[PDB]
Design a binder for these strands. Sequence first.
RNA 1: AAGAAAUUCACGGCGGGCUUGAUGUCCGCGUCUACCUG
Lengths: 78, 78, 326, 326
Amino acid sequence: MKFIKYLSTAHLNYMNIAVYENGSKIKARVENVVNGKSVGARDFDSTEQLESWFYGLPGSGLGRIENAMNEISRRENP
Amino acid sequence: MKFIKYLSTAHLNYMNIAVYENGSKIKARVENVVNGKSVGARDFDSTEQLESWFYGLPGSGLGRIENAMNEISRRENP
Amino acid sequence: ERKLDPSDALMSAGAWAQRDASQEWPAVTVREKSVRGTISNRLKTKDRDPAKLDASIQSPNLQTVDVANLPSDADTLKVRFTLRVLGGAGTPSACNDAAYRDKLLQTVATYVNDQGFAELARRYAHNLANARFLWRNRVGAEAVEVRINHIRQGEVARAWRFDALAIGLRDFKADAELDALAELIASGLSGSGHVLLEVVAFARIGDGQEVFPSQELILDKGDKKGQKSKTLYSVRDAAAIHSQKIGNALRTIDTWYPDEDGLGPIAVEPYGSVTSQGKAYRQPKQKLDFYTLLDNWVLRDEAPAVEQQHYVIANLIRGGVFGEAE
Amino acid sequence: ERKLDPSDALMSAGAWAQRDASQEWPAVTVREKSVRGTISNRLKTKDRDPAKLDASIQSPNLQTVDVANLPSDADTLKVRFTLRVLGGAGTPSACNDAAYRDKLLQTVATYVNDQGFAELARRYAHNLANARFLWRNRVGAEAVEVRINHIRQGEVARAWRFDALAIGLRDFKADAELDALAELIASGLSGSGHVLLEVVAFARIGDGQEVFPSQELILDKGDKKGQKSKTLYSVRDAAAIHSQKIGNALRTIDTWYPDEDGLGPIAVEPYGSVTSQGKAYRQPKQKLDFYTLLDNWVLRDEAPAVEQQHYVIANLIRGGVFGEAE
RNA sequence: AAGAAAUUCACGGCGGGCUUGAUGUCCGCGUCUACCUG
């Protein structure tokens, strides 16, 4: 639903962050790129926050994708 | 905060033990003498213990400062 | 139409080897074969504190016992031999081909453009004075970085070899060449004709360099330091790790590239003052400056960002093509 | 009737070993037995800022301090020996049999079909030019991936052994062979007659390869990097782990397969430009492209999806059978 | 008071970076006494 770009060269698990927009919020549905079954997402404000807390996570380079993936998969927001 | 003397001729790392007193306990904040950023401290009883376990660490001379520094920097007490 | 690449990356053509410092005596200059390497020693220091205080908030009992004491650490300082006057720097910089043929092509149309621009700036602008920048500001031995300071005579011997045999054998005296302006030298035009035969894909070229600073006896050096990130706690003694090859003293290739990446006085501010290292954003690491800032238009990342649309840089192209050579 | 398999999977026939780089001198080329391996060294870098910055929302004082500072890090760059000119890559690629006999058979009727298609495309289309793709675009040493760039002469010695004895002993010069078009070579037809004797199940074949790039002295390499996933926090120093065998430098078999999986210029777009790695979805990892997209019909996952029903691909079968060889 | 279970098929990590700069470790010191390699 109103799909946009990824976060920077998945994979490393066949898992991806796969940010895509909603009409008001933006969902960050951590998912595969094969058959399609995701793990837990998180809904929040626009891309301007998405790059902000995405850059606000530790590690360098690919570890930001991975620590972002573990950070979203233990979600609070249903 | 209520600063007292060192432990015996830092450095060897630009790092110091830099014992200084609190109103009840005494903090041993292992730190630089330049800009100021420390590594982990340890809070315990008075100077009478500080020289006791400080002399209770192995090595001779400067190695007591160094092994005391590694002993405080892997701290238990926050 | 014809947007920029999403992820472009170019191979470092005009590559660079490591240096193995090794010490010699003059009139034994020619026989640098059994010349022994220079082991990184371990001096063991003690000092005072020349680093100033932080001026926000203090307690005055700190700084007196701060200054009075001894920061006695060990420092691995590489030192020359006892009875050796000369020096050594053995580096085969080999120049790769393909000045703008990429390594990643996130859009093939941009790759056809950039191959068109190597076709223009390699067809129209001949690389005579280009490689005269990569030679006349790297034969004047900025190769030897801090050890250039007050040499008697720092002689560079850029031998060049097909094979075990070596034909191009050019010899120099790098104290007769400045570091601010490239002056007209015939043999420097031969070597720049040879890097002309390198970057424009004519021959296998690896320039075995043997630089001989003839400074003095047991004096210090400027070998490339390592780091102390999460190793100043297990050892907690050393503070300057002069990096090593197998039993010798390195100059890391990272430092060794702005020996030869120091090309362009084509910056915004200076005229004949500063000849910095030709980089994207032209930033020198010393001065904490940003020559060619974002608000100016002498960026590498505005040279195809304007040239890939509008084809006009006009001879500041060289500081936007040499940003792509390395 | 005769639907596709619910879960099919094929063994990587035409397998591939690891490489152990080890350095040599020419005219000591033949005696590569005691040739020492090349340990992954550890350089230590100080950074710069060549990366472009964002265009959404900024403040122009950030690049003063950022472009000022040094985000310095350690990089484990594998570097050659001091006085060694040659190189080394010892890989026994052994070719398995059974070009389309599966490893999983979620429907046996589809397995009888696919064995019928190896019967057709192995009976009708002879594997002469097929293994001429797996040799004439892998003897021209795409084996050596990034270290192929500007060799003096990268010599490949594909020895072949029954046993401790070795009979098929073919020698080459891989700079005389292109990487865009396979040209007519007699000994390349011998080696492709030998992989003819491999994929069509005739003999035990393990090709001990010994590639000798004769580039230069202490220059860098292109060894296969490891990763820094959840290891850039405990150590937090290295940023490029050149992977190791026991005391040497790998080339991971993962990179080593598209040395030889680079088969087909049978893609949608190019003619004589790009000879990519013959894969399902034909995706190269460099360019972030999808040659043979879903909307085109040059997929591997449309080659039995059409051939298992209608038997017509007509010599694009090779980029739909070599997708099943590996 | 558990007893049996083909987890496997294959898989380009590369791309490029100046670590640097500067330093008093010194000061004293009884190893110690004897003894069948048969």
